[PDB]
Amino acid sequence: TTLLNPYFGEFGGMYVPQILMPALNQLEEAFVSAQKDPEFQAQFADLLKNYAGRPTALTKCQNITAGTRTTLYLKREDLLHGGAHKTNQVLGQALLAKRMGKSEIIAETGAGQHGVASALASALLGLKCRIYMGAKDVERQSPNVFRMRLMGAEVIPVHSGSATLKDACNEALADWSGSYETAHYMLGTAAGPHPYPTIVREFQRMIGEETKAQILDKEGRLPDAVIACVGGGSNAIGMFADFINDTSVGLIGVEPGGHGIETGEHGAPLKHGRVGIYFGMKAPMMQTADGQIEESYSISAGLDFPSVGPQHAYLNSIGRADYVSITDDEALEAFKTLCRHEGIIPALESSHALAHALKMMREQPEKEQLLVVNLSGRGDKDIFTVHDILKARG
Amino acid sequence: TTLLNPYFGEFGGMYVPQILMPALNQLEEAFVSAQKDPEFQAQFADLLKNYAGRPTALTKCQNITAGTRTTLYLKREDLLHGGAHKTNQVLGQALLAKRMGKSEIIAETGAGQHGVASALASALLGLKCRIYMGAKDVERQSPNVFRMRLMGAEVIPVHSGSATLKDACNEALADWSGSYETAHYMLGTAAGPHPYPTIVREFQRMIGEETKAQILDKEGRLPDAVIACVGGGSNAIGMFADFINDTSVGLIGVEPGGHGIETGEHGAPLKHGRVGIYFGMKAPMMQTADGQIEESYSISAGLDFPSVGPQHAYLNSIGRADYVSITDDEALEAFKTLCRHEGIIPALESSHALAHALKMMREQPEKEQLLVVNLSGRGDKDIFTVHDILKARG
Amino acid sequence: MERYENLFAQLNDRREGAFVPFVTLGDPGIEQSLKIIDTLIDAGADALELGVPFSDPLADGPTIQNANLRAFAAGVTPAQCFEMLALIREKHPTIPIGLLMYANLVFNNGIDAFYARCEQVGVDSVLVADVPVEESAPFRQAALRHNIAPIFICPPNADDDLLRQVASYGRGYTYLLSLHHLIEKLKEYHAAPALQGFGISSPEQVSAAVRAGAAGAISGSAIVKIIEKNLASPKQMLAELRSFVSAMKAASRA
Amino acid sequence: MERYENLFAQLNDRREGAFVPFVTLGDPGIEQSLKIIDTLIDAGADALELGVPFSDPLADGPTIQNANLRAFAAGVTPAQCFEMLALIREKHPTIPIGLLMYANLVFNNGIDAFYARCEQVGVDSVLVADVPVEESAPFRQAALRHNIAPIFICPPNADDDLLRQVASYGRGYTYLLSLHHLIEKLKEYHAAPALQGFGISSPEQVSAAVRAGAAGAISGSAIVKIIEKNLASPKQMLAELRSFVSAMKAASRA
Numbered sequence A, B: 001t002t003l004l005n006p007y008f009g010e011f012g013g014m015y016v017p018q019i020l021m022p023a024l025n026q027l028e029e030a031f032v033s034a035q036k037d038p039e040f041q042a043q044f045a046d047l048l049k050n051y052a053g054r055p056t057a058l059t060k061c062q063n064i065t066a067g068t069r070t071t072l073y074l075k076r077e078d079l080l081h082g083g084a085h086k087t088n089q090v091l092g093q094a095l096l097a098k099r100m101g102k103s104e105i106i107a108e109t110g111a112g113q114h115g116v117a118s119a120l121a122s123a124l125l126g127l128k129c130r131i132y133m134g135a136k137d138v139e140r141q142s143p144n145v146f147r148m149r150l151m152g153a154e155v156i157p158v159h160s161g162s163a164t165l166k167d168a169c170n171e172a173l174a175d176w177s178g179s180y181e182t183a184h185y186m187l188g189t190a191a192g193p194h195p196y197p198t199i200v201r202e203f204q205r206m207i208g209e210e211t212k213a214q215i216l217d218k219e220g221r222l223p224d225a226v227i228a229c230v231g232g233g234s235n236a237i238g239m240f241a242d243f244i245n246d247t248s249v250g251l252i253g254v255e256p257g258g259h260g261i262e263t264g265e266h267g268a269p270l271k272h273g274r275v276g277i278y279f280g281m282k283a284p285m286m287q288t289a290d291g292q293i294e295e296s297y298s299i300s301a302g303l304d305f306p307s308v309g310p311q312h313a314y315l316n317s318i319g320r321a322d323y324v325s326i327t328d329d330e331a332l333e334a335f336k337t338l339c340r341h342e343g344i345i346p347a348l349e350s351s352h353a354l355a356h357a358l359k360m361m362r363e364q365p366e367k368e369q370l371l372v373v374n375l376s377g378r379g380d381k382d383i384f385t386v387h388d389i390l391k392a393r394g
Numbered sequence C, D: 001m002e003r004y005e006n007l008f009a010q011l012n013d014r015r016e017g018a019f020v021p022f023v024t025l026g027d028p029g030i031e032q033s034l035k036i037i038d039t040l041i042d043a044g045a046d047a048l049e050l051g052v053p054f055s056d057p058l059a060d061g062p063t064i065q066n067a068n069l070r071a072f073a074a075g076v077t078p079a080q081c082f083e084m085l086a087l088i089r090e091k092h093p094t095i096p097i098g099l100l101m102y103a104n105l106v107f108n109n110g111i112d113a114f115y116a117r118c119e120q121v122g123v124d125s126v127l128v129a130d131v132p133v134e135e136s137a138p139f140r141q142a143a144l145r146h147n148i149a150p151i152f153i154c155p156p157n158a159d160d161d162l163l164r165q166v167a168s169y170g171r172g173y174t175y176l177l178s179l180h181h182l183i184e185k186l187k188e189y190h191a192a193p194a195l196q197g198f199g200i201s202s203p204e205q206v207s208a209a210v211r212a213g214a215a216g217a218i219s220g221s222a223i224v225k226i227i228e229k230n231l232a233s234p235k236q237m238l239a240e241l242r243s244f245v246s247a248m249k250a251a252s253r254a
């Protein structure tokens, strides 16, 4: 029994060990309570505006579309505090933890971006944050490890199992199974068991709400399509939610195609994987023929995830949203294009969304179209990655 | 003959070779024309808002002042596009270059921050940007060099003379003396010859205008003091300008005290140097007893400058603003304090301003005071610097 | 289901509790895992609880996580595990065999087809670790169609509604996570006999579980540590396992 | 001022233009700089233009920038330069000596005190490179009080108002940056005699300057390059300088 439906069509659910069900039910009830509480809503709006810098701009990019009939705007989540959209929902989940009377946050991180987001919200709201991290990720993500510890989080290096992200997760959930009365598990994307896909969407849906008001102000009509990259699915569901019932507006989600779908080295399960059950949910995933979860790949660590949130799988199934993939080299070209023509350095994750809008424009340069790309984050963090690739190719 | 007074009391002037006077007069007349042009004003406001993300938040920091009678807000220039206040005025100067019919921008940079700012505005506005840089700075500021070239700027390594910043400057001005009909010299601070101190103030004064409206909205009164770091003086004059005639509001400028004023290794000429003439202006500077310009020092490269804008020297002289210094170690403590207690990683330049507000609070914890610090930039760029120091001390 | 009913009837006639070890199939190699399992049985195991290595086993503790990694290093797959299960049943006709599974390996080629393969090789129960009672309908239905007991965990944070569901839906045994109140309510609701599990690593905890009213106890990390500590001496590994299992089993006897 | 008036009167009686080299005092060391200067004079320099090394000489071209760096490597200071200037005047009573200065070294201990020290050692003119006519009042006033000519640059982008100011305020010579129209207007306004400077590196440019109506020409980078190319052979440096200066000076003669 839940208050809200845990499934989106066939996808979603609560596939956790029985001992974590009370924590999930507690969270769902806290969230439903919060959503009807004008004070909770006012507190969240206050942090979003005066701490994180919302609303974010909606920037028209005329230089990049010159000579075509495409008008392109970028939703500037790269200007949010922390440099990515991740900040919005970790503030919301930190407030929910406090509403449940909790003073501790539990998180796990591979790449280190969700860890930094969780540590900054916890620093602001007086929460003790412990972040589990595979010892191999600790070793390779020194900058992010140092940001988390500067912000007071305890970064716990996991050596158990294979000392990677899945092992940080297991430890984080084991901890959470014993400490959920005083600790909240801050999941970083729109996936995992209910009620996380729902909560993360509702705490990112201001991206699309703002985009709607801003595009109506500037153009007097809705977009022909809104386009966003898709790792687990939080920035894309954030942009798409408020347009779901505007049936003229296309919803295009872009998964990473890595070295090319045909190579097997990609992060595109929604279109190229198969339904399975893992991480608490029934969803498309990259798997071996006997059901082992396969390794994902992307040039962008933020999109390197072998599954996708269940609402995306549902929207695809019914034909309301369309999902495509963009390779490493197409993402790198969009990254260079934006730097040179608009003076904006985009995250490589976001560069996948931008690469697909550029293909829509260049393939059909005389089609009149109004497109919005969610620029989910800034790419100062990607300059060495881009530099060493381009140096290597000479 | 000029339209505006080039001096602030004794300080300022136009101490350039005669061949650059027509370029300065041309610029001043373009600026005076622009300031009366509603269309220029609308274009600048449009880029500030929809491209750079203005207005910036004004964040109250309750965790840091807990247990004291200080209320502290931070003006969030760290959330501006590019991560520092420098973006505001380079957009304004790029528009002035275009008003004068110019399609090229000339700049010089040591640390690389003004170079990145100039390259991003030039990319956005269709300007060819060439940035002179001492070969020694090129070597040490790889990340910033790569951002500039990604944004299409030509980074010209200077080997002449001592291959440092003063040599990049000489080359940049020599170029400008031959090409000012088609090129504009984008000076990056509120210093140099008139009309630069004036133009940079007027194109940064939205920081203080916004701060006034925001503090009146949130507290219903003006600040007891506004506090900002001072290298050349652009972010501090930007914050102070709109409060100059509000005589109850303190104006506190913070120069870098480096290893300690008594060591000689600092960047605090306004209070510890002596008036001289250099870089086109009469102003306080760090000099040897026989008039050679001395080398400045700060842990923060952005504040490592041996002189200060003339309006600051003037405001100090008349007692309207007060100037102090903050050492490397005090700046590092403020940097750690902000990360841990508010989840905001501040630039080390801005950490000097924050360190002085923390001293005002801690020295007199029962004085009731409302303070605003200009958080001029974000400190992701400083994490290795901070990390290697703290690692070295163990 | 029949094998569990037969074993709990026989143990109750003897006023004895059951002792049930857990091991990961294939750890540390197929051959050595078959010899470990025959030693566990020869030493007095009443039933077995057997894990099929999975890539993302979020409920396994660190000892077990390392058992999965050894099995994967030996190249063990689910298909190889089913081959092992058939041979184990071919050698031991009455011991109840239960699997500990993760939902994707059951769902992977069809939930019904997974319980059909279990029936074909002689498995008696399946516990899917990441399926709570709220999501168990298709798993428990397929299990009952193939005469396989669906096993449910009864956690320490169980409420009355959970107890009633676990009693009603489960068969074979109820997995009681380490308990008098839970035990008494389970019997009141006619639940499958309880086996206490989690942290059981000494004789006195087996006897305490039976004294509390449980039908027996499960021990996995204690058994897996003996494997992990003796990888370089397989003979010594089997002798230590025999010693540990016969002491644990002796604690269950009247 | 008297020395320049005397020299331009004498050269005009001979229908000759002046040839004026520029060098940085102290490059590449004090002793070698004194020998270079005596060679320039012995070879036919009519007047000298001498730079005092400054740390941030934003108007110096790269050849000159490197001359400053050599002088700083030899530890040359303004005080040492004034000592050199006194000895140069003590050896050569009539040659006009003009300095090329940056404003901070003039302002540093008092603008009046700088022009008093110039008068004391025998300097005849000072050109402050970063002081435009708009800012020159205190410099030109102090210069005239100490019988020193204030020199102004007349650039290629000069307008009529600039020409009139340069004519009115300057003394000694007008520094004409490389020109018939500018030259004719300067004479119309009774400006100090013009010396063309910038890029003068061959005999034909000296004669062209005099044919255009200028009173002479200044050459600095061409002279400084000879120093820079012969650092390892000071004897050869002086012989090459003598050859270059006597060819340039011969071009100025009627």
Ligand SMILES: O=P(O)(O)OC[C@@H](O)[C@@H](O)c1c[nH]c2ccccc12
Pocket: C022, C049, C051, C059, C060, C061, C064, C100, C129, C197, C198, C199, C200, C218, C219, C220, C221, C222
């Ligand atoms: O290892 P322990 O503490 O003795 O408890 C047995 C447990 O590991 C075994 O039954 C088991 C292995 N994996 C599981 C997953 C969920 C529930 C139980 C299990």
Ligand SMILES: O=P(O)(O)OC[C@@H](O)[C@@H](O)c1c[nH]c2ccccc12
Pocket: D022, D049, D051, D059, D060, D061, D064, D100, D129, D197, D198, D199, D200, D218, D219, D220, D221, D222
């Ligand atoms: O070097 P050139 O091209 O021959 O021009 C002499 C010039 O260098 C010398 O007169 C000079 C040295 N520094 C200056 C600064 C400003 C004006 C002139 C100068």
Ligand SMILES: *Cc1c(COP(=O)(O)O)cnc(C)c1O
Pocket: A084, A085, A086, A113, A188, A189, A190, A229, A230, A231, A232, A233, A234, A235, A236, A302, A303, A347, A349, A350, A376, A377, A378
């Ligand atoms: C983390 C991240 C993403 C990917 O996660 P989603 O949950 O799919 O949004 C995308 N862009 C940026 C900039 C990120 O930091």
Ligand SMILES: *Cc1c(COP(=O)(O)O)cnc(C)c1O
Pocket: B084, B085, B086, B113, B188, B189, B190, B229, B230, B231, B232, B233, B234, B235, B236, B302, B303, B347, B349, B350, B376, B377, B378
């Ligand atoms: C460049 C910079 C400064 C220093 O320059 P001012 O002109 O004095 O403002 C201060 N803070 C930041 C973050 C900077 O980038």
